[PDB]
Amino acid sequence: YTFIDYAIEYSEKYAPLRQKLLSTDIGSVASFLLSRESRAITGQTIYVDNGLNIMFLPDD
Amino acid sequence: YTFIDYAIEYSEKYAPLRQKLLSTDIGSVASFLLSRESRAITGQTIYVDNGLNIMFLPDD
Amino acid sequence: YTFIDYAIEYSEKYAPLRQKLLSTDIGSVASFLLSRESRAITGQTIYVDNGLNIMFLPDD
Amino acid sequence: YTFIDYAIEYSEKYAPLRQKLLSTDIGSVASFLLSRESRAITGQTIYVDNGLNIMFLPDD
Amino acid sequence: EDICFIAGIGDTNGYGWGIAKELSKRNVKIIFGIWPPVYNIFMKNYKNGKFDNDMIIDKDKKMNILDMLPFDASFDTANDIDEETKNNKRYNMLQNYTIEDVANLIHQKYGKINMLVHSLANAKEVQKDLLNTSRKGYLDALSKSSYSLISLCKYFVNIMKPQSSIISLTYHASQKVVPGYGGGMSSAKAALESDTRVLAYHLGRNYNIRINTISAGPLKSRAATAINK
Amino acid sequence: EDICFIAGIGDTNGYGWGIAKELSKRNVKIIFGIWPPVYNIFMKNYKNGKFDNDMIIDKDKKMNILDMLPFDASFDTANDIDEETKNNKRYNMLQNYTIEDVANLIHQKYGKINMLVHSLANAKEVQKDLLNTSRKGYLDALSKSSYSLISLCKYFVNIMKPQSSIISLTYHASQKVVPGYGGGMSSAKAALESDTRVLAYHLGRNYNIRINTISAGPLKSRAATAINK
Amino acid sequence: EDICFIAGIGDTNGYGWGIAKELSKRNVKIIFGIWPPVYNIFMKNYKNGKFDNDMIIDKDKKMNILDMLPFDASFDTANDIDEETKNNKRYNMLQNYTIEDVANLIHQKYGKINMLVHSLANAKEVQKDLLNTSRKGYLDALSKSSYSLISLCKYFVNIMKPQSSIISLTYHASQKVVPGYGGGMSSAKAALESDTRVLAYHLGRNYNIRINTISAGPLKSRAATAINK
Amino acid sequence: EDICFIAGIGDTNGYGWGIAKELSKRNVKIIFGIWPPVYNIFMKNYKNGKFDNDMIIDKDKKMNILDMLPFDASFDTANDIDEETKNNKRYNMLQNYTIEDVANLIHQKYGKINMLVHSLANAKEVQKDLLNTSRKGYLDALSKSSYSLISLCKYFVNIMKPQSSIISLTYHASQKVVPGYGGGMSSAKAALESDTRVLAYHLGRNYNIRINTISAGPLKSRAATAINK
Ligand SMILES: NC(=O)c1c[n+]([C@@H]2O[C@H](COP(=O)([O-])OP(=O)(O)OC[C@H]3O[C@@H](n4cnc5c(N)ncnc54)[C@H](O)[C@@H]3O)[C@@H](O)[C@H]2O)ccc1C(=O)c1ccncc1
Ligand SMILES: NC(=O)c1c[n+]([C@@H]2O[C@H](COP(=O)([O-])OP(=O)(O)OC[C@H]3O[C@@H](n4cnc5c(N)ncnc54)[C@H](O)[C@@H]3O)[C@@H](O)[C@H]2O)ccc1C(=O)c1ccncc1
Ligand SMILES: NC(=O)c1c[n+]([C@@H]2O[C@H](COP(=O)([O-])OP(=O)(O)OC[C@H]3O[C@@H](n4cnc5c(N)ncnc54)[C@H](O)[C@@H]3O)[C@@H](O)[C@H]2O)ccc1C(=O)c1ccncc1
Ligand SMILES: NC(=O)c1c[n+]([C@@H]2O[C@H](COP(=O)([O-])OP(=O)(O)OC[C@H]3O[C@@H](n4cnc5c(N)ncnc54)[C@H](O)[C@@H]3O)[C@@H](O)[C@H]2O)ccc1C(=O)c1ccncc1
């Protein structure tokens, strides 16, 4: 089932937040970073992945 | 002239962004994170420091 | 079967290096760091965990 | 005086350890990583720079 | 219709205020948690209008402060309160200033909130570098600057609406060494940052609440000028 | 009155479209840079209303697309296109598709813009793992996925006002290993992230322009499916 | 001629022993710091030869244990000792087990050392996840697992030869969330790691002493099996 | 009885030589892979004893160089060398200098080795900063400084016994910005570091071989001086 379907299933089952990640989720963060509201942020790698990046070991 | 004044002088000199950092610069970022616009972000340490954190050694 | 047994089972399965981690594996590394051979190293967090720490999500 | 002489002077003046960094210093760490003594270390970026990498802001 | 509790304030020169001003743009109601010692004097300035100019919202609006309450992040519940403070001239006239008490207090006066802000830090020995910091000073820093966050979350999650958000303030000194920032504050900021992840996992899976921290640059407030190195 | 150029849209299923949507919510004009291999097909679909029900926005809003231009991030300037791709079935009818040309075309037609979005990647050997990736393929992944960002900046920085912002997308595989994300794409992401800092220093100091990157979760888009594992 | 003090031991199934065995290969003399509660029983096994097989050095040599001493990382000096323990059945017959006392004790019996090992961790509420950990449990973890390191350094630097080295043990849970590792241990390991940098700066510039930490993988000892999740 | 191939030596002033020295202290046979542009000159110097007082080792020891071979990490296989460099003044007299060929030559002459050292980097535009680096130059820095490591591994992994180790050198500029380290070298270092993990997974699981990288401080070597700033 290709690498990507595996990645979606695993994320939705092990990420801190359970909701399905939508393009608009990355879209609204991108909108923010592009607006003056983030005038003080730069050179950063900002994660928008329901927190999966913070985990080390799963559970089940 | 207090530890704090040195830090701000250094930041306004070697930081990627030259403008003065405002309490509202952090506030706007805080606003965004407390809203649903950032529903896919969690457990992150987000830098709002005019990018100073990306620097290794000053070019001076 | 205790938190510890799960961790070792998981490590011996998904870690880059398959061998069993020995108390002396950490000891040898400790020896080296306590010697002049590593006189240019300091303030570091050195990983001796068969590389498990470099993994994001298990391939299973 | 080229980028490198600047880097050496700054390192020797701001690094945790003051000694001059020698090729043999990186040499002995490399020898270690290559020997069985580090059989449990892998995929790592090991710093051998007298600790300069740990600093954020200088002093003088 | 969104309410935000800002814990950690004393004046309008800190980050708490800057956060409060920006949230007002989105018309969120703000509740300030003020450290007892300066609660009265703070109410004074306010009553005497010393903050009127600092309350004007960009949008040509007045910052909507729902309430100012005495709050001490070193006490989890009323039973944690010790004799010395129970006699402390500045705590006498006050009451319900422990984390659980203000959580219940807010919940009873205004219902549930959906935004939480941890904006307070304290270290008795901040002027000393790590190696010259006592066990007491070190732990006082972690209790006030770190554990307080975990505690706020534990007691405030009960009074929060679903999908509510949480944030705290930290400093890059936790990752890279900045000499002068002592008393174990660097230590505290390192734990606050690691705890933010672990709390995000639990709060995320269990309540669907998010938690994040902002590593800020320098701001000349008052708690920052007290570092003096 | 903000204008944003989005590079990396070839259908409404990727992150670009989602970004264009959210940008429209805040009413920013959008220009789509489209890759020639799928340019006409995209135009045709758009024209026959095959995207119509995808430009919808909760607030009744309907995406506002300022322009749709052919664009290939493989070429910095016109003198860069090889004769073959120059006479190729898809590129013949087209012109001004190099980074320099589109940058110029945009400025010439709408003036200076203030938002730039890099939403693309590519690698011929993504299916193969690092060890088995050839120099050719590896250099291809980096040329298309990482260098394009730098070139994109170099040319657009000049048609961008001060305080404008730039963003690109990345994936955590750059920092931790994920088997299956091959072809050197994890390597390209690691370079993009490091370059995002180097560029922030320079663009910051010299133009007062910001650049950040977003490490996204999984999305079933055309590109992603290309992995096949 | 090199002496190493290993603080944090109870049996031969921990890391302290593994470190002790390897150092013996370089013929360094070892001094063990044992937590009072198990000091006697530990001396028992030893006297009755329960560790003879665990002492054989690869090199067909016998591990050279210079001395075993009662050591409690929760007490900086004798004046820090409280009444309850001063009456604790297991502390009565003992003496000079506080950090400063054993530092002086070693220095008086064997002179200066050049190697220090911090290999101890403790959290009363390790079985609970962060959110259900009390202030007491959290701080007990930081005092025993973190501040102890800073304290060891402060008092032992006086009895160390120039260019001496120092190390401690940590766990990746401080950087990434591993559920189950609770009681604020993750918090403690995060501060221990940050403190290692700050201590390296000070100890490096001032004494030319190095300090580093080893983030280890799982080992089935005893303090690790007590976590049980 | 260990044999180590070092790639990246063109004089006794770089890190390679220092590595070869320390390896000799532990009595490991050393094979030097030498770049053609400076191959003969190196041979001549070595032959006339111009390195004689540099092969000295505290313990009276004198480096033990097993072999010195011409080697260019730009070429994976013989079918990779372009006709020009093939007929070039320096490469004509030479043969078996591609990664595949030297790997084969080594195995054919000494059998399987168990140590591999990548001590090289190069970038045509190192003097220019990222923004002003051309695609050509950028791809060159990555091809020579990063891909060579992967290709090096792919071919040598087969002439290496199990438990063998590999190492390369990197610089912190990959993680934090250092103006002046241009040409895309900071980008190449970032890729090398990320690739060091991906490779460790694969080489680990399939061959039980380790690979790590060393982030070194400043050294005034030929390469370093090339920066000129
Ligand atoms: N002021 C800065 O520049 C700065 C501020 N922060 C964080 O921002 C937050 C507050 O900002 P200020 O400190 O900027 O703002 P305030 O918002 O000026 O100060 C915070 C509050 O601590 C409160 N206090 C102490 N204990 C308690 C308690 N138990 N209960 C209730 N109140 C208590 C006190 O009443 C005060 O209002 C803290 O978490 C800080 O550590 C983080 C980083 C920086 C920083 O310190 C820095 C230093 C050097 N270079 C760059 C940046
Ligand atoms: N999940 C994802 O889809 C994902 C996507 N990204 C990045 O997001 C960006 C957008 O990718 P996407 O939306 O997935 O892909 P997409 O293919 O849907 O859309 C982008 C465009 O790439 C365009 N194309 C290729 N080369 C060119 C060129 N040279 N000029 C013009 N057009 C070109 C192509 O025509 C397409 O329209 C890229 O930089 C990605 O690598 C980053 C991370 C994740 C990811 O891969 C992932 C994997 C496993 N777990 C979690 C996340
Ligand atoms: N055992 C492991 O697998 C492991 C061990 N460590 C660290 O290794 C060190 C000790 O190793 P063990 O714990 O492995 O070894 P021991 O060396 O088995 O245990 C340590 C000592 O704590 C001592 N104790 C408590 N308080 C005091 C005090 N105040 N004074 C004197 N003694 C006291 C106690 O007497 C005991 O001897 C600690 O700093 C650990 O946190 C770090 C990481 C790992 C780990 O926990 C882990 C967990 C899940 N997945 C992977 C790895
Ligand atoms: N200070 C340093 O010299 C330094 C060196 N390194 C790395 O250490 C390694 C060795 O570099 P060095 O010793 O400085 O340089 P070197 O030039 O002295 O020796 C290495 C060899 O590169 C060889 N050459 C180029 N291409 C090829 C090829 N394709 N095939 C065969 N030979 C080739 C060349 O002939 C030379 O003998 C490289 O991977 C470096 O990037 C990493 C970090 C630091 C660094 O640049 C730095 C900068 C600022 N502050 C601190 C540190």
Side-chain angles (χ1 to χ4, degrees):
Chain A
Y1 59 174
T2 277
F3 169 84
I4 192 67
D5 298 324
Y6 170 52
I8 296 172
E9 149 166 55
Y10 185 103
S11 182
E12 296 181 358
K13 289 189 178 182
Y14 292 112
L17 288 307
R18 259 35 176 50
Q19 72 241 201
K20 296 172 178 293
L21 184 69
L22 310 180
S23 52
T24 50
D25 287 325
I26 280 59
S28 54
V29 179
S31 188
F32 165 69
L33 287 166
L34 289 175
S35 83
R36 279 278 293 170
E37 291 306 282
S38 55
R39 71 186 294 251
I41 307 178
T42 195
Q44 307 293 290
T45 292
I46 284 72
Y47 281 90
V48 185
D49 64 345
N50 294 319
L52 213 206
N53 74 82
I54 72 181
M55 307 308 300
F56 177 37
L57 306 178
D59 319 297
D60 180 60
Chain B
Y1 55 177
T2 64
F3 161 79
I4 192 62
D5 285 299
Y6 162 59
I8 166 170
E9 188 184 310
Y10 184 100
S11 176
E12 287 177 355
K13 187 169 183 287
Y14 302 109
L17 272 35
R18 219 67 84 73
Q19 76 258 194
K20 184 178 183 185
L21 185 67
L22 306 172
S23 63
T24 60
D25 291 328
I26 279 67
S28 63
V29 174
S31 193
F32 165 67
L33 293 175
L34 286 169
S35 70
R36 280 275 297 178
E37 298 312 84
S38 67
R39 73 187 286 247
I41 309 188
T42 195
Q44 303 302 291
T45 287
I46 273 34
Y47 284 89
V48 187
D49 65 339
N50 287 328
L52 223 223
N53 75 88
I54 67 178
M55 300 310 299
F56 179 30
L57 301 178
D59 54 302
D60 186 55
Chain C
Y1 55 177
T2 64
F3 161 79
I4 192 62
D5 285 299
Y6 162 59
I8 166 170
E9 188 184 310
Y10 184 100
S11 176
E12 287 177 355
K13 187 169 183 287
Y14 302 109
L17 272 35
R18 219 67 84 73
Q19 76 258 194
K20 184 178 183 185
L21 185 67
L22 306 172
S23 63
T24 60
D25 291 328
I26 279 67
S28 63
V29 174
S31 193
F32 165 67
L33 293 175
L34 286 169
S35 70
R36 280 275 297 178
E37 298 312 84
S38 67
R39 73 187 286 247
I41 309 188
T42 195
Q44 303 302 291
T45 287
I46 273 34
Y47 284 89
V48 187
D49 65 339
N50 287 328
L52 223 223
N53 75 88
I54 67 178
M55 300 310 299
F56 179 30
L57 301 178
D59 54 302
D60 186 55
Chain D
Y1 59 174
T2 277
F3 169 84
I4 192 67
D5 298 324
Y6 170 52
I8 296 172
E9 149 166 55
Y10 185 103
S11 182
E12 296 181 358
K13 289 189 178 182
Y14 292 112
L17 288 307
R18 259 35 176 50
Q19 72 241 201
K20 296 172 178 293
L21 184 69
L22 310 180
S23 52
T24 50
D25 287 325
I26 280 59
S28 54
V29 179
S31 188
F32 165 69
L33 287 166
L34 289 175
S35 83
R36 279 278 293 170
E37 291 306 282
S38 55
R39 71 186 294 251
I41 307 178
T42 195
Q44 307 293 290
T45 292
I46 284 72
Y47 281 90
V48 185
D49 64 345
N50 294 319
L52 213 206
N53 74 82
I54 72 181
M55 307 308 300
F56 177 37
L57 306 178
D59 319 297
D60 180 60
Chain E
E1 296 298 294
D2 290 326
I3 307 176
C4 175
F5 181 44
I6 309 289
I9 273 302
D11 57 56
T12 70
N13 307 325
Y15 277 135
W17 196 259
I19 301 183
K21 289 188 65 188
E22 290 301 306
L23 279 172
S24 292
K25 280 188 171 55
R26 301 178 182 185
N27 302 305
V28 328
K29 287 75 180 303
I30 292 70
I31 296 288
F32 288 129
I34 300 75
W35 186 46
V38 303
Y39 175 71
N40 290 319
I41 186 54
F42 181 89
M43 289 300 276
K44 196 179 184 64
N45 303 306
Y46 175 71
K47 190 181 178 185
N48 309 324
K50 304 303 175 61
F51 305 139
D52 296 48
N53 279 308
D54 308 2
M55 293 191 275
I56 56 180
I57 312 307
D58 288 358
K59 301 199 58 49
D60 183 290
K61 273 189 177 66
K62 189 70 174 181
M63 182 171 104
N64 191 71
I65 302 177
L66 213 206
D67 215 339
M68 267 95 71
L69 292 170
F71 171 89
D72 194 315
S74 63
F75 302 128
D76 298 307
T77 67
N79 46 293
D80 296 301
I81 194 65
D82 67 282
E83 303 295 55
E84 186 171 2
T85 57
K86 296 169 66 62
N87 294 304
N88 194 57
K89 174 183 176 64
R90 307 323 308 167
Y91 291 68
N92 293 167
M93 66 162 276
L94 300 182
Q95 77 290 300
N96 296 311
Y97 53 74
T98 69
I99 299 174
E100 176 177 61
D101 294 324
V102 337
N104 290 161
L105 208 302
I106 301 289
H107 180 60
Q108 182 181 66
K109 287 175 179 173
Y110 314 116
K112 307 197 172 306
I113 68 181
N114 36 287
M115 282 176 235
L116 184 51
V117 175
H118 178 284
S119 187
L120 66 89
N122 184 66
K124 298 170 180 174
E125 294 166 47
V126 62
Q127 292 181 305
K128 303 173 186 173
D129 55 10
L130 255 207
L131 261 179
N132 292 164
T133 306
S134 67
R135 188 175 299 262
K136 182 181 190 176
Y138 185 95
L139 300 180
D140 181 70
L142 274 121
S143 176
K144 268 76 165 301
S145 310
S146 291
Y147 186 71
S148 59
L149 166 71
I150 292 174
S151 190
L152 254 190
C153 289
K154 175 178 184 176
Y155 295 109
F156 276 62
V157 56
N158 291 149
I159 69 163
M160 299 184 96
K161 301 198 293 182
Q163 313 189 318
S164 61
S165 196
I166 304 182
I167 65 169
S168 59
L169 284 292
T170 188
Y171 176 43
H172 194 47
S174 65
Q175 306 313 313
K176 301 297 183 186
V177 31
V178 5
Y181 193 73
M185 272 313 300
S186 66
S187 306
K189 294 305 192 182
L192 177 78
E193 283 172 44
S194 176
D195 292 355
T196 286
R197 287 184 283 272
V198 183
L199 282 175
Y201 172 74
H202 293 311
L203 294 171
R205 287 291 194 66
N206 300 168
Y207 311 109
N208 192 52
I209 285 182
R210 301 180 299 108
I211 185 169
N212 290 286
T213 190
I214 305 180
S215 201
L219 187 68
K220 193 175 181 58
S221 49
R222 184 184 181 301
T225 307
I227 302 177
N228 183 293
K229 175 67 179 61
Chain F
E1 284 299 302
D2 298 316
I3 297 174
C4 173
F5 178 56
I6 299 181
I9 299 185
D11 62 64
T12 73
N13 303 305
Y15 276 127
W17 180 267
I19 292 178
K21 218 168 176 186
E22 293 306 303
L23 284 169
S24 288
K25 278 191 175 62
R26 311 192 187 192
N27 299 295
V28 317
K29 286 105 187 69
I30 310 295
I31 297 173
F32 293 160
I34 318 184
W35 199 35
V38 309
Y39 175 66
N40 294 318
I41 161 188
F42 190 88
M43 297 307 286
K44 162 185 165 59
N45 279 298
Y46 169 69
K47 192 174 180 179
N48 301 313
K50 297 308 175 69
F51 298 154
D52 276 40
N53 276 302
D54 294 13
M55 299 184 272
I56 293 183
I57 295 177
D58 289 359
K59 286 190 61 59
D60 153 291
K61 290 195 185 69
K62 198 70 175 184
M63 283 182 67
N64 182 68
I65 324 307
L66 213 198
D67 210 325
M68 287 173 43
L69 314 174
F71 166 75
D72 185 331
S74 302
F75 312 119
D76 305 307
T77 68
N79 86 264
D80 276 296
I81 104 288
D82 50 275
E83 179 193 358
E84 179 176 345
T85 51
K86 196 172 182 59
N87 301 313
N88 182 81
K89 155 71 153 48
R90 314 301 289 177
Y91 296 70
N92 290 185
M93 62 175 274
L94 313 171
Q95 58 181 301
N96 300 299
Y97 49 91
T98 69
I99 298 175
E100 172 172 51
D101 294 334
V102 294
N104 283 182
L105 200 178
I106 296 289
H107 177 46
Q108 203 178 64
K109 190 172 189 174
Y110 307 113
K112 288 189 187 300
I113 64 176
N114 71 326
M115 286 184 188
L116 181 58
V117 173
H118 180 286
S119 183
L120 51 69
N122 227 341
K124 288 187 174 185
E125 302 183 36
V126 72
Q127 287 169 292
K128 299 161 180 166
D129 50 7
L130 258 206
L131 242 198
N132 300 142
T133 296
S134 76
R135 188 175 299 258
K136 185 182 180 174
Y138 183 96
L139 295 179
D140 184 68
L142 270 105
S143 168
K144 269 59 176 296
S145 304
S146 314
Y147 188 72
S148 44
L149 176 60
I150 305 175
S151 190
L152 218 244
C153 287
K154 182 203 166 191
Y155 288 112
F156 274 77
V157 59
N158 280 55
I159 61 176
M160 294 187 100
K161 307 180 186 176
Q163 303 189 306
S164 300
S165 177
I166 303 177
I167 63 175
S168 65
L169 290 301
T170 180
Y171 172 43
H172 194 53
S174 57
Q175 307 312 311
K176 300 297 183 179
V177 358
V178 298
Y181 196 64
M185 268 309 292
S186 66
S187 321
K189 293 307 186 184
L192 184 73
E193 290 181 32
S194 180
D195 291 352
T196 294
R197 287 178 294 254
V198 179
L199 290 178
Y201 170 71
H202 294 303
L203 293 172
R205 289 303 199 73
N206 306 162
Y207 308 95
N208 190 46
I209 289 171
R210 303 186 292 108
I211 180 171
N212 289 280
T213 183
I214 290 175
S215 195
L219 184 67
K220 188 165 180 59
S221 61
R222 214 187 185 307
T225 296
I227 312 274
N228 165 284
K229 210 66 182 58
Chain G
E1 296 298 294
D2 290 326
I3 307 176
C4 175
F5 181 44
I6 309 289
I9 273 302
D11 57 56
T12 70
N13 307 325
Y15 277 135
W17 196 259
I19 301 183
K21 289 188 65 188
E22 290 301 306
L23 279 172
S24 292
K25 280 188 171 55
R26 301 178 182 185
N27 302 305
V28 328
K29 287 75 180 303
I30 292 70
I31 296 288
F32 288 129
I34 300 75
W35 186 46
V38 303
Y39 175 71
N40 290 319
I41 186 54
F42 181 89
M43 289 300 276
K44 196 179 184 64
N45 303 306
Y46 175 71
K47 190 181 178 185
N48 309 324
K50 304 303 175 61
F51 305 139
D52 296 48
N53 279 308
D54 308 2
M55 293 191 275
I56 56 180
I57 312 307
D58 288 358
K59 301 199 58 49
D60 183 290
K61 273 189 177 66
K62 189 70 174 181
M63 182 171 104
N64 191 71
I65 302 177
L66 213 206
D67 215 339
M68 267 95 71
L69 292 170
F71 171 89
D72 194 315
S74 63
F75 302 128
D76 298 307
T77 67
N79 46 293
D80 296 301
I81 194 65
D82 67 282
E83 303 295 55
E84 186 171 2
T85 57
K86 296 169 66 62
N87 294 304
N88 194 57
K89 174 183 176 64
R90 307 323 308 167
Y91 291 68
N92 293 167
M93 66 162 276
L94 300 182
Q95 77 290 300
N96 296 311
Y97 53 74
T98 69
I99 299 174
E100 176 177 61
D101 294 324
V102 337
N104 290 161
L105 208 302
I106 301 289
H107 180 60
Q108 182 181 66
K109 287 175 179 173
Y110 314 116
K112 307 197 172 306
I113 68 181
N114 36 287
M115 282 176 235
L116 184 51
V117 175
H118 178 284
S119 187
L120 66 89
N122 184 66
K124 298 170 180 174
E125 294 166 47
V126 62
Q127 292 181 305
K128 303 173 186 173
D129 55 10
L130 255 207
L131 261 179
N132 292 164
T133 306
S134 67
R135 188 175 299 262
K136 182 181 190 176
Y138 185 95
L139 300 180
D140 181 70
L142 274 121
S143 176
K144 268 76 165 301
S145 310
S146 291
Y147 186 71
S148 59
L149 166 71
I150 292 174
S151 190
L152 254 190
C153 289
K154 175 178 184 176
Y155 295 109
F156 276 62
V157 56
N158 291 149
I159 69 163
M160 299 184 96
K161 301 198 293 182
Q163 313 189 318
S164 61
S165 196
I166 304 182
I167 65 169
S168 59
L169 284 292
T170 188
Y171 176 43
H172 194 47
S174 65
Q175 306 313 313
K176 301 297 183 186
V177 31
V178 5
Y181 193 73
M185 272 313 300
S186 66
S187 306
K189 294 305 192 182
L192 177 78
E193 283 172 44
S194 176
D195 292 355
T196 286
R197 287 184 283 272
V198 183
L199 282 175
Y201 172 74
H202 293 311
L203 294 171
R205 287 291 194 66
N206 300 168
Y207 311 109
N208 192 52
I209 285 182
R210 301 180 299 108
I211 185 169
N212 290 286
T213 190
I214 305 180
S215 201
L219 187 68
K220 193 175 181 58
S221 49
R222 184 184 181 301
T225 307
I227 302 177
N228 183 293
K229 175 67 179 61
Chain H
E1 284 299 302
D2 298 316
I3 297 174
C4 173
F5 178 56
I6 299 181
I9 299 185
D11 62 64
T12 73
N13 303 305
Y15 276 127
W17 180 267
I19 292 178
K21 218 168 176 186
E22 293 306 303
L23 284 169
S24 288
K25 278 191 175 62
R26 311 192 187 192
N27 299 295
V28 317
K29 286 105 187 69
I30 310 295
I31 297 173
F32 293 160
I34 318 184
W35 199 35
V38 309
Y39 175 66
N40 294 318
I41 161 188
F42 190 88
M43 297 307 286
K44 162 185 165 59
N45 279 298
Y46 169 69
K47 192 174 180 179
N48 301 313
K50 297 308 175 69
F51 298 154
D52 276 40
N53 276 302
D54 294 13
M55 299 184 272
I56 293 183
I57 295 177
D58 289 359
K59 286 190 61 59
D60 153 291
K61 290 195 185 69
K62 198 70 175 184
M63 283 182 67
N64 182 68
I65 324 307
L66 213 198
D67 210 325
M68 287 173 43
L69 314 174
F71 166 75
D72 185 331
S74 302
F75 312 119
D76 305 307
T77 68
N79 86 264
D80 276 296
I81 104 288
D82 50 275
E83 179 193 358
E84 179 176 345
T85 51
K86 196 172 182 59
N87 301 313
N88 182 81
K89 155 71 153 48
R90 314 301 289 177
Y91 296 70
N92 290 185
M93 62 175 274
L94 313 171
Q95 58 181 301
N96 300 299
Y97 49 91
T98 69
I99 298 175
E100 172 172 51
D101 294 334
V102 294
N104 283 182
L105 200 178
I106 296 289
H107 177 46
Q108 203 178 64
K109 190 172 189 174
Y110 307 113
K112 288 189 187 300
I113 64 176
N114 71 326
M115 286 184 188
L116 181 58
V117 173
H118 180 286
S119 183
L120 51 69
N122 227 341
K124 288 187 174 185
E125 302 183 36
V126 72
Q127 287 169 292
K128 299 161 180 166
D129 50 7
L130 258 206
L131 242 198
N132 300 142
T133 296
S134 76
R135 188 175 299 258
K136 185 182 180 174
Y138 183 96
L139 295 179
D140 184 68
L142 270 105
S143 168
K144 269 59 176 296
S145 304
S146 314
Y147 188 72
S148 44
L149 176 60
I150 305 175
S151 190
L152 218 244
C153 287
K154 182 203 166 191
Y155 288 112
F156 274 77
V157 59
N158 280 55
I159 61 176
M160 294 187 100
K161 307 180 186 176
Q163 303 189 306
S164 300
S165 177
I166 303 177
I167 63 175
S168 65
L169 290 301
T170 180
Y171 172 43
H172 194 53
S174 57
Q175 307 312 311
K176 300 297 183 179
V177 358
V178 298
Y181 196 64
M185 268 309 292
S186 66
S187 321
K189 293 307 186 184
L192 184 73
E193 290 181 32
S194 180
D195 291 352
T196 294
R197 287 178 294 254
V198 179
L199 290 178
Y201 170 71
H202 294 303
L203 293 172
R205 289 303 199 73
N206 306 162
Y207 308 95
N208 190 46
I209 289 171
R210 303 186 292 108
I211 180 171
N212 289 280
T213 183
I214 290 175
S215 195
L219 184 67
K220 188 165 180 59
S221 61
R222 214 187 185 307
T225 296
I227 312 274
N228 165 284
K229 210 66 182 58

